[PDB]
Design a protein around this nucleic acid. Structure first.
Lengths: 124, 138, 72
RNA sequence: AGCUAGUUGGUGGGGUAAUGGCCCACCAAGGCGACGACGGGUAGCCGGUCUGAGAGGAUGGCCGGCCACAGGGGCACUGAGACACGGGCCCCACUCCUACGGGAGGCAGCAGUUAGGAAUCUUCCGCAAUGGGCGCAAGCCUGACGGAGCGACGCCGCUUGGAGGAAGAAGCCCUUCGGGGUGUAAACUCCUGAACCCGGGACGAAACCCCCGACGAGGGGACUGACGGUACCGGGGUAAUAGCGCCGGCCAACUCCGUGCCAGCAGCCGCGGUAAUACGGAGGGCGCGAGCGUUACCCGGAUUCACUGGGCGUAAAGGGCGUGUAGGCGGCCUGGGGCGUCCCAUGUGAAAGACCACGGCUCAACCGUGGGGGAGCGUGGGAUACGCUCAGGCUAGACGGUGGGAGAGGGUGGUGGAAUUCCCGGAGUAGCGGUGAAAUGCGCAGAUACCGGGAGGAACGCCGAUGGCGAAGGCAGCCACCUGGUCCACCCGUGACGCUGAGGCGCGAAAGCGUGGGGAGCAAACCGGAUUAGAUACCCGGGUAGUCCACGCCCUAAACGAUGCGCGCUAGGUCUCUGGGUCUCCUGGGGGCCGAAGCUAACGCGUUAAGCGCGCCGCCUGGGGAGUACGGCCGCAAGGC
RNA sequence: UUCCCGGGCCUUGUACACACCGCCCGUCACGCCAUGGGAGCGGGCUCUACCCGAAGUCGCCGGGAGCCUACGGGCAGGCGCCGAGGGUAGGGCCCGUGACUGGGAAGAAGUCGUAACAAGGUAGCUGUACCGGAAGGUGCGGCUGGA
RNA sequence: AAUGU
């Protein structure tokens, strides 16, 4: 556009959508579970992903992933939501932080633990 | 009606040289001569002369090029590789002396118009004046 | 959830399925599940065609050049 | 998208420290708005701060400055100052006392509780210092403040050790069973000595005051330390914490087993289906280190809103086309003003911060001192090239005059033939029509085919294209009338009168809509016959809107050159429509084809630009959801914007 | 050498490329996700009119009425404008919510055809109109991004 | 003269 046109209208400043409305852009957010499910992935992958419908403090009832191998989440447990989609399961945009509240760390886990709740296992 | 006279001129030079034309004409303007006077002074053009086309006064610019070359495409490299108008009528450009442009690290000129007449970026810088950056040539 | 649950079959019935399973590539698959008159979880097995080779498209240029580079 | 009645202004008042519609009478009809008013949403503002090559973007926590508030809300009193955080009156909410009639209160001071939340600290020590208030003074008060406390929350410093030490223990991991690796790593030998114990121990503090001198200047004397027996200094002195992320590519770092699209990973591409360097563990390696990772948010990358620094023939993107308002842009010569613009001088640019130089804590982090920048903006003087403005002149743009020209440009009134259908009349007999082949259908109630007459509607063969005209849509027999545009010549006239154009207005294929008319042929819908598995189709026989006219609507399209309009500059060739020429050839306007230079992702474009420039408008910022919904305007409706 | 099967070479169209045994469109059935409409309900904010109206300032009075005086006055008190708040009624913008309903996206070897891509087997696409289980077909006109 | 997990 002409310089005059730019003076008249000006450039449209960007503006980006929040990949995750965990409200007030807070880091994580606590919320109760209404449904602890098992869902089947997209088209190339097959499995029974452990996700759980959670009702956050911020009034949102959103789906969330449960990492690790095995969990102890009940049809009404207190969970802390993190934030991270799962290019595999549709409307699933938040990971459940293992190792907080009712969400237990991973038993037997020994590797990338910091990111799986589990504390440092004494070499017994 | 020809919107920008200078821009037209600078462009004729371009197109013209672009085809290794010995010289091309441009509608005579006193201001335009001043520019050409500088193009000449810095040897971007052999020179130029005031002439007439059916009573109408013009300027004839005698272009300059490099020597013929070896290999395919023997065309000589231009002396005026780049000639571009800076301040246009749609967006006039002005520079204070401290903000006057440095063209091609120095191997390029930056003609401009100050209240002290039409000077290059050095002549101008050396005089203490800035003004309407006309165009840069290299 | 995924556990190696054990099944219950007559001894002569169990051997007939072993004869077929070890010998050839025929699967035994859960055909369905329910509860009989007595009210016990009773699974229905089936005889399998097996086969069904899973086509896997292959070799991504990237790897190819990659190996050439290093090997030599 | 319009808003406004104390609204805008006026005269006179009331009020205040003071101007003022701040308030009030009265008079007038004013004020503001596409340069975005009014309304909605969000928000305390700056110094700075993070990011960034920069121009930019993002932010306003700590510290400094301003503003606003003090449970919600109103009000004044006092006073130099408040319409007052720990002052007052009142209503409201809430909690508390009561002898039930009325009392006490507000932590967004410090510290603390509870609620909310992912999450945010001691009911502390001291007025020694600095600052404040009061007082002649001593002094009192100061949860300002100087400190200690808790939290790896952040930055900087520090430690877990240093020199030796095997063809290389064990264990563990791999192995072409030789052996390779962890590994100089350890054990081991020396060695130093965080921590801890002992002893010494701050600067911060010299004043108010007292004395001499006049309580001035000056000189002398005296007290006072929260942090703290801490920092630090000296003696002695034990080797005395290591974790976390990653190892398919981007990305630095590979092997064995387990699992068998399961369990699981995941930022993107993607791994996992029985040898997984991608899942889980182990061995090993890489990065980093009292930290390492994750999540969220900002900038970056992203020239991915492009000013620096992008585009629109086919990738997203040219408005369907004109006329034109605001606005933006403007040829040649001269003179005045000197607004933009440039220059010099000067004021301001508070501190802190950032930069730089030197110093203070053992370094650093921090901190002190000094130095240099700093846009902007005010004032003063100067410059006049370019822009602006006023004036004088010019004719190269544009417009006009005379003279020719071509054309399916438009509107009205007529009228010419060929053809179809129907009716009338001759003649005439067994089929006609139709397809791939059939059938429905029409026909012995006399069709098809043939001659004549009549009615009526619609469209105009050849010419005729690769042509012409028009802004687009679009326009085709002929004649007459009314009427637009455009080209050339002579260079005669005016004298920049120009370019573009958000809104606006008008024009706008076909279909469609309303009245009224017309209706031959054609033909959605419809009905048959075929075909087919079916055939709500393609093929055949019928057939109504409609196609035609008048007036009024609708306003869309592959409204396409998928290419906005104007101007200037960049080889040529060949065909063609139209005009002028000293018509062997040159020249102007238009339409095609190939191709210099150049452009392009490529295809292709190329004097009819998609080249090289300038002015202005329109438009695009991934695919889908969607040209959808909501809102609004428009329309009879369909539906359009 | 038309036809059927297979195959050369060149050229052409292509939305194919594990390559026509390719690709691919719409309804329908089921399940899930977000959203529009929806008899209406439940709010938040704001606007207008009127009724009652604390405190308080200001404006009258300050007298059949008390108190101070240096009797000019002053205070108390009485009245009034304004007035926080409350009450009633009606509008506006936004948000939640609703039986039922419209379309949209995703889902996995569902059901029906086959519109498109090669004359996709009737060139395709397009504006509009009508019609039909569905893609779509047909009329009128346009484009070539077709012959 | 249709279709192809």
């Amino acid at each position: 556009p002409t310089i005059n046109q730019l003076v008249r209208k000006g450039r449209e400043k960007v503006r980006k959508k929040s990949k995750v409305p965990a409200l007030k852009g807070a880091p994580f957010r606590r919320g109760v579970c209404t449904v602890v499910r098992t869902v089947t992935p997209k088209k190339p992958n097959s499995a029974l992903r452990k996700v759980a419908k959670v009702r956050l403090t911020s009034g949102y009832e959103v789906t969330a992933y449960i990492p690790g191998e095995g969990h102890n989440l009940q049809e009404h447990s207190v969970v802390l939501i993190r934030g991270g989609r799962v290019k595999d399961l549709p409307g699933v945009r938040y990971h459940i932080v293992r190792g907080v509240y009712d969400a237990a760390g991973v038993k037997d886990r020994k590797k990338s633990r910091s990111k799986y709740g589990t504390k440092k296992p004494k070499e017994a | 009606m020809l919107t920008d006279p200078i821009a037209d001129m600078l462009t004729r030079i371009r197109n013209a040289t672009r085809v290794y034309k010995e010289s091309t004409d441009v509608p005579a303007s006193r201001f335009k001569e001043e520019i050409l006077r500088i193009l000449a002074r810095e040897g971007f053009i052999k020179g130029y002369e005031r002439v007439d086309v059916d009573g109408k006064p013009y300027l004839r610019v005698y272009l300059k090029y490099g020597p013929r070359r070896q290999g395919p495409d023997p065309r000589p490299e231009q002396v005026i590789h780049h000639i571009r108008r800076i301040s246009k009528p749609g967006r006039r450009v002005y520079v204070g002396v401290k903000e006057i442009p440095r063209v091609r690290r120095g191997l390029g000129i930056a003609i401009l118009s100050t209240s002290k007449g039409v000077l290059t970026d050095r002549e101008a810088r050396k005089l203490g004046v800035g003004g309407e950056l006309i165009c840069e040539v290299w | 959830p995924r556990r190696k649950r054990k099944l219950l079959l007559h001894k002569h019935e169990l051997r007939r399925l072993l004869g077929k399973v070890e010998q050839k590539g025929l699967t035994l698959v859960p055909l369905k599940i329910y509860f009989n008159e007595r009210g016990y979880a009773k699974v229905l097995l089936g005889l399998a065609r097996g086969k069904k080779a899973y086509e896997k498209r292959r070799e991504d240029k990237k790897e190819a050049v990659r190996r050439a580079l290093e090997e030599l």
